[PDB]
Symmetry: C3
Subunit: 331 residues, 3 copies
């Protein structure tokens, strides 16, 4: 195939690696979902992925890592979440100038954290996106002349919650919306598209995504989160990412590991509330910080029983193949 087609294949795998799937068709579906939700965000995310993969090539990173989309999955989130939190509205073309530059900083961090994490056979997952986007949103801020960001300020009043006005249909619809909020999209249709794309590659990832999103919603209800945040899906994207990560990918899937994944989703939801309340002091949002922190603290956990088995990163692919390999190695 032509090198351009290979590069676009890498970009398509990267845009889907956010949800822990390496599949070009799922990447196409996710791109279609992003364009369904907001074309400007899709353009910004595609530019972020392209520039992140180009910087990975320029910095002479491992070709296998680039071909698997391990470097493009942070540029998409950087571009999408810098277009989401822009106060200048849609099609502010100047926003593409930082979207490029900060995307170039994703492979660098991706490499740096790797050097830190290879000591513990620990994955650095979406952590560079968090650092890069926190850097950008703090550098610019809401009071910037060129690239202002939306205003986030800490809660200063007791919320008015009427539990007789809760809508169970929207509370359930927060599951696909929570799935879609991983990329920053709040449209229910793009959330359903993301669920379909997850199911194409591996059904276990889709099941764990739905379970993580519903656990994030349930954990948000238990601390009296305002219903607007829950309906918007803002309370269940760290949880779905954590449930996907600990569910059957980085651990061999088992009922013990399923319960561990549910516990990690709950912990990620509570850490998401904590970090949303803390980072909002600086005006910054919780952008996948809770997922990274909780997934790291649940992958470093050492447990004696043989059911909770952590796979070497070299052999992690997708949960069903992970289980097949584990049984092949045991026998």
């Amino acid at each position: 195939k032509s090198p351009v087609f290979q590069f676009f294949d890498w970009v398509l795998r990267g845009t889907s690696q956010v949800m822990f799937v390496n599949n070009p068709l799922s990447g196409i579906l996710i791109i279609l979902g992003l364009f369904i939700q907001n074309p400007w965000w899709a353009i910004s995310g595609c530019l972020g992925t392209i520039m992140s993969t180009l910087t990975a090539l320029i910095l002479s990173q491992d070709k296998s890592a680039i071909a698997a989309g391990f470097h493009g999955y942070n540029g998409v989130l950087v571009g999408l979440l810098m277009a989401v939190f822009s106060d200048k509205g849609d099609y502010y073309w100047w926003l593409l100038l930082p979207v490029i530059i900060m995307s170039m900083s994703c492979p660098i961090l991706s490499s740096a954290l790797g050097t830190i994490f290879s000591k513990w056979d620990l994955p650095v997952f979406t952590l560079p996106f968090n650092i890069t986007v926190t850097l950008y949103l703090a550098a610019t801020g809401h009071y910037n002349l060129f690239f202002p960001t939306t205003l986030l300020q800490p809660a200063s009043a007791m919320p008015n919650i009427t539990w007789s006005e809760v809508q169970v249909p929207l509370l359930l619809r927060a599951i696909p919306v929570g799935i879609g909020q991983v990329y920053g999209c709040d449209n229910p249709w793009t959330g359903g598209i993301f669920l379909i794309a997850l199911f194409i590659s591996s059904p276990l990832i889709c099941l764990h995504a739905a379970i993580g999103s519903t656990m994030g919603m349930l954990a948000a209800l238990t601390i009296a989160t305002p219903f607007d945040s829950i309906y918007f899906g803002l309370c269940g994207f760290n949880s779905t990412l954590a449930c996907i990560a600990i569910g059957g990918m980085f651990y061999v899937i088992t009922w013990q590991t399923h319960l561990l994944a549910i516990a990690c989703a709950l912990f990620a939801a509570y850490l998401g509330a904590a970090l949303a309340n803390m980072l909002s002091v600086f005006g910054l949002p919780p952008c996948t910080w809770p997922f990274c922190l909780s997934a790291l603290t649940f992958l470093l956990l050492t447990t004696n029983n043989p059911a909770i088995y952590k796979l070497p990163l070299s052999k992690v692919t997708y949960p069903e193949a992970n289980r097949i390999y584990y049984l092949s190695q045991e026998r």
Copy 2:
């Protein structure tokens, strides 16, 4: 003995492991002190210890670690410091619902940090409690509908300190109160009870606790801390914990190590002031963060002279036995 008696022995050792003592009688004395100060806080702390040890058993952690109370010493602090910082007052039974849940997160972190720290033969001491309680207090906050917390806000005015109104008797009484503030208790009687419990196991721990508390008070006076904070003992619990840790436990006790412990107590007091001023921006208090940070930065210190000897964690028990073992190994 019956398994229930063994479990309660583990809980009693855990409730005393906060002050670095593994002794069921000292645990009983500390529980009696907590009940003397506030029965509700004692109930919350006991529930925290019970659920932390139960989660350690469920997660199939090392049985020797559980039997020594290495997992129950974080649940007690989580429960106590979540009951202390509750705005709903005494006997708010719903507060036991998070006290359980967050306690379950203490062994997990305890394991995770262990995996991080075993590379440097470094102890993770009370660090999970800090993370868990900071998570809870940030997630809920003072403006929560269900579990509101007490309001902490950064200093915005120059304090009015009259040095002619300082009370030397209360300034001295801040030593036992500073000892008792480790568990969150401000009663002088429970501080004296804690000192007695420390002396039961090993006199060196009691001496280093008193020295650390008085160093925290003295260091707080040097930066013009308001006398109300000093009298309340809020300025000398990180210092006493750091002095206990570096005094004769994790280092072999020597006059060089005694001076190192005093320096660590001073550094922990100053870091406590810094973190109390910084974390109060988010509304969070300094909950043993300074002790952990200063003890880590004083245990990683490399010093050429043979007097400052750091013991492998496998053989740290209590300062007198530590010294006896060190002389046995040298000769």
Copy 3:
């Protein structure tokens, strides 16, 4: 030579090691620059260096490290930046009391971080100064009775920038001022003196310092930084330090490494804006935090091509000798 002369030689090398030069004459020039800018700041910095080296001797640190000034280069910054951010004005002699004490905490941290960093052959450069000065400025704060600090508060209004009023001469003069801002000095003459001192030891360090300062200024212009910050040099000292570090010292100097250094300078400038906006919430300034973070994240970067070569710390001296050694080893 007499031991006093040896100790003052160590102090002179330490006061210049901030800019990554080990040369007593450059140390004398830098001290002369500090006295040119403000004699009180020079006295505070000299006391900081003296007490940091004395604590390094007391704590029985490596004599080769002390002789090379590897321990005095943090006391100078601690003293200088605690005298800079004092609200009591010039010749407040009581300020020397903490300048001593916090200086004693520089070797300790210097050792501790070393134990953390030797696993990755990673340098701890100016990181203890950041921790110590952040500790001091947070503990005291602007509302302290004894040692108040200057008030820094987050931006709460959109800045009024008139691009027709920009002064190219001052914008260029921000290069030597940016060089001098490493020590906290804003005088153009002391910046020129620092550039001369850098050129005495090794011209590559001077060139990379100027390039880093101009990259910091250019990166500050791109996010609409107020011109007062740029003219003052506050936007280009982290950048010049990062450019010096990654330029030819810790990497073998090459055009690939030159571009890497320029990229690191840009990243350090943007991280400096981010941390200036974030830390100002607590009232703290960005004091070489961006340099440390960006230099660490660019020294952990793993790159396949042989041009980007990282030197073992044992053999890093100065960029020209680094290149000479690398070619000697290759052939």
